[PDB]
Design a protein around this ligand. Sequence first.
Ligand SMILES: Nc1ncnc2c1ncn2[C@@H]1O[C@H](COP(=O)(O)OP(=O)(O)O)[C@@H](O)[C@H]1O
Ligand SMILES: Nc1ncnc2c1ncn2[C@@H]1O[C@H](COP(=O)(O)OP(=O)(O)O)[C@@H](O)[C@H]1O
Ligand SMILES: Nc1ncnc2c1ncn2[C@@H]1O[C@H](COP(=O)(O)OP(=O)(O)O)[C@@H](O)[C@H]1O
Lengths: 124, 434, 443, 99, 434, 61, 66, 99
Amino acid sequence: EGEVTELTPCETENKTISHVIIGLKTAKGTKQLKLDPSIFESLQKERVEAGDVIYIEANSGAVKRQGRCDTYATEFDLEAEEYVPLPKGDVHKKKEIIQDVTLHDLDVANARPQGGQDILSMMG
Amino acid sequence: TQRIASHSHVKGLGLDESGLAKQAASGLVGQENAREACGVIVELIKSKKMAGRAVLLAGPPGTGKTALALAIAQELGSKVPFCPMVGSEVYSTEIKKTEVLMENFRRAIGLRIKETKEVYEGEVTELTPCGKTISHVIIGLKTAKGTKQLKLDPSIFESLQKERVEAGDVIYIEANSGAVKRQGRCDTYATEFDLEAEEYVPLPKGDVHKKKEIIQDVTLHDLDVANARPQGGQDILSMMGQLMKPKKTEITDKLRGEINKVVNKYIDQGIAELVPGVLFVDEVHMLDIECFTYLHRALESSIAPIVIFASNRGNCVIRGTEDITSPHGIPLDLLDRVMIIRTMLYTPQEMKQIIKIRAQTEGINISEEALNHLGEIGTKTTLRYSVQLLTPANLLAKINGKDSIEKEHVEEISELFYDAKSSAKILADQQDKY
Amino acid sequence: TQRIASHSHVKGLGLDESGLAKQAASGLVGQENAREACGVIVELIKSKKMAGRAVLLAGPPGTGKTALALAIAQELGSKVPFCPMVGSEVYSTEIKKTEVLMENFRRAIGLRIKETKEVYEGEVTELTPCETENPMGGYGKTISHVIIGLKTAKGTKQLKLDPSIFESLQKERVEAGDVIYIEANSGAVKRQGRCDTYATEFDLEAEEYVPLPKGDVHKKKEIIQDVTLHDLDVANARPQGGQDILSMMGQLMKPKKTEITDKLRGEINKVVNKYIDQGIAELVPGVLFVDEVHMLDIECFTYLHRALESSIAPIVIFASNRGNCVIRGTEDITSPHGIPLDLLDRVMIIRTMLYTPQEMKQIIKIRAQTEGINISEEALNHLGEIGTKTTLRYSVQLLTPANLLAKINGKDSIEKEHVEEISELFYDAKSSAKILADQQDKY
Amino acid sequence: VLSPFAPDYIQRSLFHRKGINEESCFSFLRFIDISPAEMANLMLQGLLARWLALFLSLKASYRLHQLRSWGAPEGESHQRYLRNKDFLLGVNFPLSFPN
Amino acid sequence: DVTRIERIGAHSHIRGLGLDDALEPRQASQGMVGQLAARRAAGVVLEMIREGKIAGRAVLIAGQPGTGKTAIAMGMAQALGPDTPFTAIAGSEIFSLEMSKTEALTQAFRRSIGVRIKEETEIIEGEVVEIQIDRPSKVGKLTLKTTEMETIYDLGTKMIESLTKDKVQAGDVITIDKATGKISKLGRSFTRARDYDAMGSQTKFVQCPDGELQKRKEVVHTVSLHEIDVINSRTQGFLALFSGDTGEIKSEVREQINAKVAEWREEGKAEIIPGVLFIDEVHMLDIESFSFLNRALESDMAPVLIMATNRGITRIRGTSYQSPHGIPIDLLDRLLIVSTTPYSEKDTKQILRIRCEEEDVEMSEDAYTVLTRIGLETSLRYAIQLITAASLVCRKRKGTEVQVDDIKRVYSLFLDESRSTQYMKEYQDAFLFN
Amino acid sequence: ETEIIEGEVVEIQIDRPSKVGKLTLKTTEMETIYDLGTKMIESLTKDKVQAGDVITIDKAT
Amino acid sequence: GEIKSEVREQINAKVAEWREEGKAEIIPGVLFIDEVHMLDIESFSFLNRALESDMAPVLIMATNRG
Amino acid sequence: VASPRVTAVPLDSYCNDRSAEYERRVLKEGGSLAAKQCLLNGAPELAADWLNRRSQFFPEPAGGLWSIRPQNGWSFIRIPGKESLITDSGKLYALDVLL
Ligand SMILES: Nc1ncnc2c1ncn2[C@@H]1O[C@H](COP(=O)(O)OP(=O)(O)O)[C@@H](O)[C@H]1O
Ligand SMILES: Nc1ncnc2c1ncn2[C@@H]1O[C@H](COP(=O)(O)OP(=O)(O)O)[C@@H](O)[C@H]1O
Ligand SMILES: Nc1ncnc2c1ncn2[C@@H]1O[C@H](COP(=O)(O)OP(=O)(O)O)[C@@H](O)[C@H]1O
C-alpha cells in the first residue's frame, strides 16, 4: 500500500495488455512493481488515477482505494474527493490476522460466488 | 459385462406367426390371453393407421404386466420410440401437471431422417484465404492414406479461427453438421519445442474423407423444447449466458400448432418420416382427477400417440375426490374408453417354470430338489420371494465352496429372509412395543 | 359498431331534481329504494367529504344491483375513476391478497397534471457556425454561437444556440434535411430521421424517411395528463430508465407483481400533498366496486377493517348474491350474507327485491328494443308467463334465437309459435335439474 | 433446420396464403419493427443480439415517442392502410419514460 | 403410404356439419346421425356466432354420457368455417403453478377474440447475381435475378454499410424492403452453394424466386388479441409468447388494449371477428372461477361460451354442496342448456355403417346385429374398438370380409368395465387397498 | 453537519486538452472565485450548469 | 426477503457501537396489532421468545373476542 | 460498514487437452469481447463512445459498472481512520468539545 506515482499498462500483440507497471511512492522509499491484467481490471474498476493511495493484497487479489493524498488538496479550492494523509511504514508488510468465522458462513461462501474479482461475481 | 436387469430375460411376447401364444417363448410362460391381445396391439401399432388408442393391463401384483409392456417394447423393435412413465413423476415444481402429460405425449412421437455423414479429417498443411472480405479459404488435409484439398466458406473458416486452427493441426470436420473440432497438433511438430502446451497425437489412419450412412431419430419433445424458449446455447464462451439459470416453462398452443405445420412440409418433401411412439404409464390409479380430465381430451385428440395404462390395485378411492370410489382406482369416464385386459395368478407349475427361466437367465445352476422346494415356497407366500431367494443361495454356495445350489443352502436362506406375510404376522405380537 | 353488452342498456340512475327516483329512467324500472340510496351515494362521491365508506348490496340473483353499481359510474361520468374488481382476482399466485387490495385502493384514486410544452421541429435548411471576431493572444479562434435553420410548411425560422449543443450535433449523426426533435425546456436534441423529400434520389437506402412536420416551428401547447396513484406507485416501484446494466437485465427479466412497502406509499402521499398545496395537480377520488364478496378469505375480511379505517381508503361498494353461508377459511363458522359480523357491521347494507311479472314484461320490452327485436303482444304475454315460471334472465335469453329463427322464416316479428319452438328446444335450468334426477343413476 | 422460425418460412407463410382470409402466425411481426430474419437471428443467435436489439429499442422508443406526440390527424387514405410500429403501445402510456 | 402428423381419431371421422336452409338436420349428414333438437339449436347458435352482434353469452349442453357432446361441438366448430378464432380447453388446463387461475381464464377469454387488419407493403425478394461497391461517399450496385427478370439496384452509402455489416456475398437469396430499410437473408442458391466443399453451421437452400422481383401489394393480416398483451407488457413479447413464461398480467395494460382497439374500431381500419371458447367437463371447477364467470359474461367484450357437463349432480371441489351440473345456481341461470337424447338401437346400425367407411373394412349385415348388440348392451366406444380390433384378426385369418367369429374372438379378448369389476370382486381380496 | 456553498454563478470556464476550469460566483455580501477540479467539472457538466444559475455545491459530499 | 441472521446480528452490534460512540441515538417505537386472535400460533411461539431481545420494542395488541 | 467475513473464488475445470485450456482462458479472462465491453460500458458503441467521449467536453452517462459506484469500495477492506480514534478515550472527546 502507498501512493501511486505512475501507472502504465504494457502492450503486447495478440492490442492486449500482458503486464502492468505501477510505481509506489512512500515516505520510506519508492519501489516499482508489476501487476497482472486482472489487478489492472480491479484498478480500472475502482477508477484508480495517478496520485491516489490504494490498498493491494496478494493472496486475495482484491483491490481497494483509500483516497487521494492530502498534499494535492491545495491546488483546487473546491473538490468532491475527500483527502487522506499519506500512510507511514514500509510498502510491503506481512501481518497475521486472527479472525473467527462460522462453518455456515464458509458454507455460504463456497455455496455461492458472491465475492470475487470476476465480472460474473460482480453481476451476482 | 452388462448388469443383470429384472426384465432383461424377456425378449418379447413369444408369439407364433398365426398369432397364438406359445407356452414357453421369449422368456415368457403363461398369460397366453394377455400375450395374444398384446400381440394384436403390436400389429395395431405396426399398422400405423389408428391413433389415440389406449390399453389397460388389469392384474394382481406379480403377474408380469410390466414384463408384458416391455415385451411389447422388445417386439416392436428399436425403430418405434417407447416412453416409460411413472405416476409419481407427473407432479413437478417448475412445470404444471397437464404440461407434463402433454410433454410426454409430444415425447412419444418421433421422426426419422436419413443422411450421409462425410468425415473430412486430418492434418491441415496450409490456410490460404482467397471491397475485399473473404471469397473462399483453401485448406489442405494430409493423412497416411492420402492427401486431399477442400475450399471452405468464411463461416466455417470463422469456426476454425475461433478454434485457433493453425498449420500442422489435425482437425475433424463433418460436412452435414458443419461442426469443427480440433484434435491437436501433428506429432511431427512435437520435436521442435522441448516444452509446448499443445497436445500431440499421431497422424490419424484412414481416409481423409469417409462416406457413411447414418439414420437419426429425433423426438418431437426435444424439438419443441429447443424451439419453445430461446436456446442460448450458441456460445458457451459468453459470460451473459452463465448468469440466468434454466428452468421448465409451460408451452403455448400456438408454437405447438406451428411445429405441427412445419413437420407436414418436410414429411411431404420426403426428407423425414414419422414414427409414432408408445406412451407407457405406471401407477395410473395415483393420477389426480384433474389428470384424468386432461386424459379425456388428450385421448380424444387425433394426434395423440398410443398409450398403455398399468394399474395393480383394485377398487380404491379416486385421487382428489376423498369420498367417491371407483373400480381399479380410475373413474368410469376414462375407464370406459380404455380397453381392459384381465390377468390372473400363475399356477405352481408355471411358478417352477418362471424360477427356472430366471435361474438360467442369472446363469446359476440349481438342483431339482431346490427347484421343487423353491416352487413350494413360492406357492406358500409369493413368487417374488422365491425369485429373490435365487441369488443368496448361490452366495452361500460359493461361501461353502460349492458351485451349485442345494436344498440345505436355500433352506438356510429361507430362514434368514422373511416374507412380507410372516413379518407382518410377527409385527402383531410386538406391535405394543413398536 | 360496438358489440351489445348485457348491461349496455343501463346509462345511469336517471335521478330527478328533487332526489326522487323516476319509475322508468335510463332503462331502469323499479327498485326506487335502491336507486335513491345510490342517489345519495353518488352525492357522497361528488361531495368527497368522507373516505373509507363501504356500501353493501344484498338481494336475490337477477335484481340488478350490478346494473345499479355500473349505473353509478355512468351517472358520475368519465371525470372520476371507477374500478370494478371481482373477488376472484384477489387470489393470486405471485401477488398477495393484501397487496392486491392495496393496489386496488391506489387504482381507484387518480391525479391530473397540466403541463406546457415547447418544441422546435422541421426540416434543416442550413447549419452555420457563426463566428464573432474577438482575436486573442491566449486562444486564436472564437465562436460565439451556432445558427440552426428550420423549415416547415407554415413557415421557416432560424435559431441561435450556444456552441455547447454543437458538440452533441457533432457527437451524433446530423445531415442536411434531417427532421429532428429539439425541446427548449429540456434542451436535449434527438434525431427523428431523414425527410421524405430526399427519398426519390436513391432506389434503396437504409435510413427511413419521416415526413416533415406540418405546423409552426415553435409549438407551445398545454396538455393535461391524468395519472393514477397506482401508476405512480409502479413507476416509483421500478426504474423506467434502462441506462443501468441492472435496469437492462431486469428489463429483460419477466415482470412480476412485487409487494410495495408502505414507505413508498407515504412518500407518494407527501409529494401529492405538496403538489396539491401548489395547486398545479388536481386530485379526484375513485370509486371501487367489488362483486362476489362472499368469495373472499377470512384474512381478507379482517384486513378490510384496517384497510377501511384508513383515511386514504376510497369509497368501496360490495355486491353479495348469497344468503347465510359458511365463511370461507373456517368450517364451522356461519354468518349472514357470507360476510363476518365485524365487517358486516361497518358496511352499509342495501336490500334488493325480485321484480314482479309486470316489471319482467317491461324489462323484456326494454331489452327487445335495445337489441332491435320486435315482439308481438300475445308472444310477450306467454314469454312473461315463462319468465314468471322460471326467471327473468331465461326469458331475456329467449329473445335472440326467436329473432334469428324469425328472420330465417321470413317474419320480421317474433310470434308465439317462434317462442314456442324455442321454448321447446331449449331447456330451463330448473327443468333440466328435474330431468337430471330421473337419470341420475345413469350419470 | 426444423425450427419454426425460418426466414423463408416466414416470407412464404406470411405473404402466401391458400385463401383471401387466413390466419398465419408472425403476421403481428409485420406490424412490429422486428424483421422476420431479425427474429430468427435473435432466437438462434443468443442473448447478446437481444441485448443489442433492446439497446436500439430504447432509442426507437425515443424516436417513436417524438413521432407519436404530434402529426395528427391522419388522412382517410392513410386510415385505409396501417403503418409499421402501430402495434406498440408501450410509449402511449402517460407515465411512459419518454413522456 | 405417406403418413401425416394427423391420424384417425375418435372425433376425426366427421368433417363439417350438414344443415339446410330451414335448419332441418338430416338423418345422416357428414357422418352424424341423431340429435335433431341438438343439431338444430347448434345451427341456431352457430348462425348467432356468425352474426356476432352480441357478446357475453354462455351455452351449456346437458345429457347422458355418450350422447355426443364433443361430437356436436366439433361439428359446430367445423361448420363454423376456418379462420375463425376457436379455443377449446379442458377444465384442468387452467391450473398452473406459474400463472394464477384468473390469468388463465382471462387469457382464455382474450385469445379467442380476433382482429382482421389490412396493410399494404412493398417487398423486393430475389437471388443476388453480383455485388459491387466503390469507395473514394461509396457508391455500389447489386445484380439480382428472378425467373421472370433480372435487374440491378444502385444503393447508397449506409445501404452498403448494412450489407457489408452483415457480410452479404453474391449468390444469396435475400429480401429488401425500401420503406423500412431492413435486409432479410433467406439463404443461398443450390448451384452457387454447390461449389463449396462444406457448408457452415447455419445455412439453408432456397429455390430461385419466381414472379415479380419488387412486389407492391395489399395484404390482409389476421391477428389475435392474446399476442398484443405480451408485446405491450414486455419489450420482447414474442419470446414470452412462444415460451409461455409471461404470467400475472396487470389489468391496466388490458384496459389500455381495449381502449386502443376501440379506437381502431372507431377509425374503421380493422374489424373484430368473434370467437368460440369451449370448456369440457366443467362439472369439476373452482368456485372462484364460477364467481369470475359472472363478470366474464358481463364484460363489454367476450367470446361465445360453449360448455359441457357430463354429470347431473356432483359436489363442487373445495366446498360441500349439492347442485345440478356441479355448478352454482347463481351461474346456473346464465347458461343456455341444450338437452340431448341417447342413441337408438336402429341408429346404432347406421352410425356403425358410417364407421365402416372410416377403416374401409366391409362388414356383413349379420355382423351389425352382434356389434349393435354389444354397442347397445354396453358402451358404444367399446364396439367402435371391436370393429377395428376385429379387422386385424380378419387379416390374420386372411379373409376378405369380417365374420361374427371375429367379434366373438375380440369380445373374448377384451372385457367390459362391469366384467372387470366382477372379476375384481372375486380377486379383490388379493388386490391392494380393496 | 455539512458546509455547503450557495450563491449565484457569475461565470463558468472549462479547458479541455484533464479539463481544468474556474467558477466565479456572486452574492450580495461578497463575490467569490473558486477553481474546479476534474470530478467537479464532470459533476457540473453532468448537471448541465451554465452561467447565470443559482446552485448549491457541497465540498465534502 | 429472507435476510440472513448473521447480517442482522452484525448490524445490531454495529448500531450498539454507534450508540457507544454517541454519533447516533436510538429511540423506542410502538407496534400496533389489531385482531391478533387470527394470527397463527407459530407466530405467537416465535413472538414470545423473540420479545426477550434487548432491541425488541414494546408492542400493543388488541383482541375483539374471547 | 457491515461486510461478509469470507469470500470464495468460483471453481474452475481442469482438462487433459489444450483446447479446453483455450476455452478456459477465454471463459475466465474476457469471455466474449463485445459482451465484456458491453457489460462494462453497457454497449460496445458505449465503449467506443466512452473512449471518444473522454476527449469530449460534455460526456454522456455510462451504461454499467462505470456508472454504478459503491458507497465505500467494491472491496470490503476498511481502515478505521481518524474518525473512530476519538471515541476510544473520553479525554479526547471532552478536549474536542472544549476546543
Ligand atoms: N409369463 C412370464 N414368464 C416368466 N416370468 C414372468 C412372467 N410374467 C411375470 N414374470 C416374472 O415377473 C417379474 C416382473 O413382475 P412385474 O411385471 O414387476 O409385476 P407387476 O406388473 O405386478 O409389478 C419378472 O421378474 C418375471 O420373471
Ligand atoms: N331494473 C332493471 N331494468 C332493466 N334490466 C335489468 C334490471 N335489473 C336487472 N336487469 C338486467 O339483468 C341482467 C343481470 O342482472 P344481475 O347482475 O344478475 O343483477 P344482480 O346483480 O342484482 O343479480 C343485467 O344484464 C341487467 O341488464
Ligand atoms: N351423432 C353422432 N354421429 C356420429 N358419431 C357420434 C355421434 N355422437 C357421438 N359420436 C361418436 O361417439 C364418440 C364418443 O363420444 P363422447 O365424447 O363419449 O360423447 P360425450 O362427450 O357426449 O360423452 C365420439 O368419438 C363420436 O365420434
